[PDB]
Amino acid sequence: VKYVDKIHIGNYEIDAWYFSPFPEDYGKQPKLWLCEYCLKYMKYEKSYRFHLGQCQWRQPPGKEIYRKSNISVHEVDGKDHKIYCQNLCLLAKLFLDHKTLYFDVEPFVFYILTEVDRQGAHIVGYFSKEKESPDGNNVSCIMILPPYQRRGYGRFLIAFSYELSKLESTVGSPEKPLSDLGKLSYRSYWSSVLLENLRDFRGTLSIKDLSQMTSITQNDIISTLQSLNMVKYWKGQHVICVTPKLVEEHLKSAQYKKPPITVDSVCLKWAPP
Ligand SMILES: COc1ccc(Br)cc1-n1cc(NS(=O)(=O)c2ccccc2OC)nn1
Ligand SMILES: [Cl-]
Ligand SMILES: [Cl-]
Ligand SMILES: [Cl-]
Ligand SMILES: [Cl-]
Ligand SMILES: [Cl-]
Numbered sequence: 001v002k003y004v005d006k007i008h009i010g011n012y013e014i015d016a017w018y019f020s021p022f023p024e025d026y027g028k029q030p031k032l033w034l035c036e037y038c039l040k041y042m043k044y045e046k047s048y049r050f051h052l053g054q055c056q057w058r059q060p061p062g063k064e065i066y067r068k069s070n071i072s073v074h075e076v077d078g079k080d081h082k083i084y085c086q087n088l089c090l091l092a093k094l095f096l097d098h099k100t101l102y103f104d105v106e107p108f109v110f111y112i113l114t115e116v117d118r119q120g121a122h123i124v125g126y127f128s129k130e131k132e133s134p135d136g137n138n139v140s141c142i143m144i145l146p147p148y149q150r151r152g153y154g155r156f157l158i159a160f161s162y163e164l165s166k167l168e169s170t171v172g173s174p175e176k177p178l179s180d181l182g183k184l185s186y187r188s189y190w191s192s193v194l195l196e197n198l199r200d201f202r203g204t205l206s207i208k209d210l211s212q213m214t215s216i217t218q219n220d221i222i223s224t225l226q227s228l229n230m231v232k233y234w235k236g237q238h239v240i241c242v243t244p245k246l247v248e249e250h251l252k253s254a255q256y257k258k259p260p261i262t263v264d265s266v267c268l269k270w271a272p273p
């Protein structure tokens with residue numbers, strides 16, 4: 001059984017990282033061809049070119065809940081746009097080892113990140129979120145397509161997931177296990193948020209305060225502070241321990257970069273459930 005090993009999407013040809021359970025006949029051709037707008041998968045260059053002349057979509061379905069300059073997020077309910085969401089999950093599984101759901105998409109909402117030009121809104125990546133998470137996960141799966149990786153889009157989508165959690169007045173954590181890139185992306189985000197907050201705030205913040213302010217879990221704050229040498233243990237409790245000196249050193253170092261893209265609360269049009 002030959003697996004899908006290469007996709008064509010828009011102007012990109014991208015090699016697979018992992019098995020994805022596209023129907024067996026789809027793996028048999030040299031490439032799988034995806035409409036970059038509706039995510040229809042096609043077996044042939046000729047069916048793909050036909051489709052691109054006929055397909056009217058120039059953006060994701062659902063509602064554009066965020067737009068600032070040419071960066072857009074669409075919110076897509078798995079129940080309302082099932083085929084689109086299944087197509088997105090099969091695409092995602094080519095680049096995610098640990099994603100296990102592709103067809104049963106109704107329980108999830110999908111947040112699609114696009115970069116816009118005069119042709120259309122071009123998919124960069126997404127995250128999925130359970131409508132009802134028994135564990136308080138604010139992200140189920142998160143993926144950036146290879147050509148956009150390590151360019152700030154992952155940090156943006158993580159920031160976006162916590163902006164939703166903050167509007168819901170809840171803490172959340174990504175569902176584990178995380179991708180290798182995901183682990184790096186999350187520690188970098190958490191490090192950046194915690195240091196920026198400790199800098200900007202006049203006076204002392206606790207771990208519980210930082211959790212309420214950021215919607216990061218106390219556990220994720222603790223592991224991040226451990227990585228920054230900014231926490232002590234005292235009679236069975238983690239206690240924040242930092243000087244504005246050490247915060248400034250971290251912010252002024254090569255280990256911290258200003259976010260390329262930030263989430264502007266003003267550009268987010270979203271009411272919590
Ligand atoms: C949640 O991130 C992912 C989850 C799954 C998969 Br597959 C990819 C990603 N991801 C993230 C990033 N981009 S970034 O902006 O976070 C970033 C910027 C600078 C340096 C390193 C970075 O990331 C390591 N690109 N891929
Ligand atoms: Cl590639
Ligand atoms: Cl292939
Ligand atoms: Cl459209
Ligand atoms: Cl999954
Ligand atoms: Cl499934």
Ligand SMILES: [Cl-]
Binds near residue numbers: 179180182
């Ligand atoms: Cl990875």
Ligand SMILES: [Cl-]
Binds near residue numbers: 171216218
């Ligand atoms: Cl918590």
Ligand SMILES: [Zn+2]
Binds near residue numbers: 037039051
């Ligand atoms: Zn299409």
